[model samples]
Target chain A: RKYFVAANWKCNGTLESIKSLTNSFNNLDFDPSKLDVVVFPVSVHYDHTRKLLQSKFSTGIQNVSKFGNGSYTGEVSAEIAKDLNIEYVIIGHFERRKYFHETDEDVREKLQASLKNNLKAVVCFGESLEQREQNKTIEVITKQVKAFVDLIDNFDNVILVYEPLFAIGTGKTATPEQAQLVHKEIRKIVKDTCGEKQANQIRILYGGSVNTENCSSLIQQEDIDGFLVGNASLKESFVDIIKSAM
Target chain B: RKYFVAANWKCNGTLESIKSLTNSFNNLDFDPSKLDVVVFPVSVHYDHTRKLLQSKFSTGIQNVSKFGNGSYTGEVSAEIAKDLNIEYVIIGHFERRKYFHETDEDVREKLQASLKNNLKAVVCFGESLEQREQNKTIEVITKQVKAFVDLIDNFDNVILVYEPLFAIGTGKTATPEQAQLVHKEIRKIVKDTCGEKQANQIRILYGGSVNTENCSSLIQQEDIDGFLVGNASLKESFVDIIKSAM
Candidate 1:
């Protein structure tokens, strides 16, 4: 499986900021043969940034509406994203769940929407700080994962992201051991449900406070396929994180 | 006051459909000196459609984030819209309140966000079918109007839209008298809160099943300054609706 490094801009950046960021990618060098890269911008700028990037790296949207079309105002549907040549869509992000009141069923419907449009889904699931402290990480994530597994018949276009809410934007990096454990459990769940062949084909990524120094160690784990980066992605050091996957 | 006609495409249309609709605008004969026109498209195609329409007609977003910016996923903020040369934003449309669960306070924050960025807001308010049947139309609409009046110090950048929930997309239009009554009450509410000078300066539009046939009669009502058209806006007949404003 090829390693994948996805950038989640997470409601950051102005048009000028995005133009500068995408322009910087023109000067970067990396071997796409070994790793695949994707950038998820806020929906409003998705098309503009996609046009600016000009296939240097793949582009994806941070979210998609479950509805296929008409009357669901303020939403961009997966079909529309796909029509714009958007390759991937991040669904069930922790921020969407926390702020937008997305339920498990909503996530399931979104995953179906992305797949129906033939867009790859970077599906996210994780435990909150309290759930982590209570030692219920596996239970919380399992329920979240099952929502997608039940909806999708195959995992070929899916990339699972283990984004612990506590670690996200809090300068808290999950120890490689901690991240690897959750990733392994996630893989095992897929393996048990869809069997080893399908499980091995699926890439499970780690997200939350992943930066240059720790990324190499994080990617060294057996189940850690790549990363879904946050803050580090806006800086030049994001190249270093991508290189670590190599 | 220059009459205003805003077209809300809602969650409808594709890239091809928008291009076709915009191209049709080239054949339109309305005098801009007589009326101001704006079109609200789904957020996904907003920029592209805005670029296509150029300065011929103004473009507005269906919604803007209540938050100014930062960390709000799946939301488009007014600052970004303003930066993109978007001139208007529709806030508190009944579809959003009914489907997305946006509260009155949420609408207030969105209005404030739009004003801070100097974007004109087509702020919407109305009574649902049940509320109208219960003889509580004024009470419901009064509460909705007060939310914005309390938050906004002035009404220079606001256009109030009275869209009765029962009338939207149901092919049911409020009669000229019915619509006029609500518009008069709404203007009175603005008069009571913001005073007559500012109230008279603000345009109150009647929306819901507004089409070519009823538009001329609707605009003739004393307090109805314009129309916020739905389905008709996607057709060539929409030009007739704008001409009615003239």
Candidate 2:
């Protein structure tokens, strides 16, 4: 698996800030041949940010409609994203699950839609604070990962992200050991569902308050293939996180 | 009230189609003094559509974040819209109320957020097919309209849109008399909540299968100020709908 670091600038950025960030991302001193990188910007800024990013870096939509290119008002469909040459879509984010009531069925639909449109699905999964406190972390994560068993026919275009609800944006960072364990569990689930070859090839990203300080240690873990970064991606420090991958 | 005509592209349009539509709309021969015109494109097309349009027409967001500039993932907040100099946001569209389970509470929150950000909100209301079949059209529409009663302290920047759930995207349209009656009831509901001045001054737009053939009679009604046009707006015939207003 390649080292993949993605910046999820969730529901953030104005025209001015986007212009500035785009310039910074363009000037980063890193060898693209050594690793892979993509930035997920809010759909409103898709045009501005995508136009400004250098060809070495890739950009994706932060959200996508489970439906195709039709009258799903206020939604940007995977077909539309594909039409725009958008190569990636972050699906099943925790905020979407919590605030917008996104269910596994919705995730299943989204995965199929993305596949039909030929867009990569960076599917997210994690357990809530309460579920973790009750020692249901493995159970909840397993159910979330297993949701696509019958719904999905192939896993060729899917990337996995594990963002603990308790750790996301709460200034709480999961220890490298904790995140590595979850990543291992996720791979085990993938192996059981698919096969050993698919499990070894698929990337499992660690997301949830991942910053420059902890990313180096997190990236050193065997099961952690990359970082799905937030908040820190809003500033120059995001360069630090990207460089940490190499 | 200004004659308001907004074309809601609703989860439709690709980069190529948007470029062509923007060009056609730019060359439209209409006197802006006779009626006001705005197009609500999906948020993804905001920058592209906004930059290409001539000064004669305005554009808006099809949806907005009920929250401000913060941790709402995959949301385009009103504050970001303001910072981007966006002038309008369509709230409570029937599709959102149906598919996304957006309640009146969510509409109230979105309205307040848009007001705080100084963006004009084109608020939508209508009854479902089941409710209308049960002879609860007026009651349901009234409840949907009256929802913002104590929740909203101001209506200065608000516009109202009436889109019957059954009429939208079904190739069916309400008659001029039936639409006029509902518009009148909507105005009365406004008057009861606010006052006579607001009731008369607030624009109520009809949205459904509004096309060139039926627009002439529909625009002639007393209470139907203008339109919140759908599918028809995706093509060049949209110019005819705008001209119908004048």
Candidate 3:
């Protein structure tokens, strides 16, 4: 099993600050043989991030255009990403779907767009806190997961990121047990909808307020293969989160 | 007389291909002193194109994000463009407004955003074929032009591009006389709204179906400063358009 740790650098970092952050990160030596590390920065930093991260680590954009090509201005397509040799793309992050008005249909098309461009994708699925309060977490998550499962028969290029929307950047963390239940449910859906081979091969990650403090226990949970880290990913604590995955 | 030939690369070219295009462009022997060239590639290519073009020629983006940072998801803000040192941006291209359903209100905000970022803007205004068929060409252009003039008093940083929607990519080129008539009307609107010096300093361009063959006569018109070229830009023929402008 590959343990993937992606730093979702979400809407943060000025050029000067990102440079300093990269400088500190560049000095650290990690065991790449056991881990897969990727960084997701804002569009402003795509080229800078790519050059700064260089050959050791891979970089990804938070989103790609749904329309492959046209005059849909201000969007980046997967084709542009392919040209840069960007190996991984993160889609359906809770904020992207909820706050940005992206529907599941939009996400599915983006996923297909990524696949067509031959790029690996991390597909996110999570329920809002409101849904959790209503005891509808499973129903909401099932619908979200099923949307992707229905569109995609082959799971070879997809990574499932289970981020409970309420926990993201809220400073309120999801307990290991809380994260495990959702991961297990998602894994079951993949197994039933796709197949056993894909179920076993697909990596389901827990995201949302994951930091070095809680990551070790979170990683030990049975179904949580890795984490799609937010906030902490921008700090030195990311090194600790990476170590926790080991 | 200076010439402004803008390339709306639309959604074409990959990041790798853009590098080659820029490299080829840099090697060209064109006189930059006489030609005020600008390239409006997709937003993903903005920073790279700015770097490649550097101080030699100005650069433009097809659109700018309305929201400023935090959780907007998949959107790049105008502040981000400002940070990149991008000089010019295109707002409300007719296709963007027509096909993609961009509201005129959004176009107004985009112009304000450009000014806030200290970025020069090439604002596009055009009547549809339907409007032309109904003989509402002047009314449509007047309305479109009024949308900008009513909001802005100064014309130093704003350039006008007049593209008749029917002629764009339709193989039906607008005759030089046809283009000049619209340019004259647009110039009149600028002069009436913002005074004579302001109007004289503003560059009014003709777009859509503008190719090398008819470019010389179009450039011959004193009021038609240059072109906001579409399909011709992606080909070598764009070079001739630039030469004709000279």
Best candidate, DockQ: 2
DockQ score for candidate 2: 0.78
| Candidate 3 TM-score over all chains jointly | 0.86
Candidate 1 lDDT over residue span B1-246, tens digit each: 779998888777888888999888757767666778999887778877887884758888888888866777677788788777778888988878887788999999999888888899899988888888899999999999998886665565789999888776566667999999989999999889988888888899997678788888889999999978887888877887887877
Docking class of 1: medium
Clashes of each: 0, 0, 0
Off by over 4 Å in 1: A169-173, B169-173
Q: How close is candidate 1 to the true structure, as a TM-score?
A: 0.96
Worst 10 residues of 2 chain A by lDDT: A148-157
Candidate scoring better on TM-score of 1 and 2: 1
Q: Which stretches of candidate 2 lie over 4 Å from their true place?
A: A149-156, A169-173, B149-156, B169-173
Q: What TM-score would you give candidate 2 relative to the actual structure?
A: 0.95
TM-score of each: 0.96, 0.95, 0.86
- Give the candidate number with the greatest TM-score: 1
Tens-digit lDDT track of model 2 for A60-86:
988888887777779988878888889
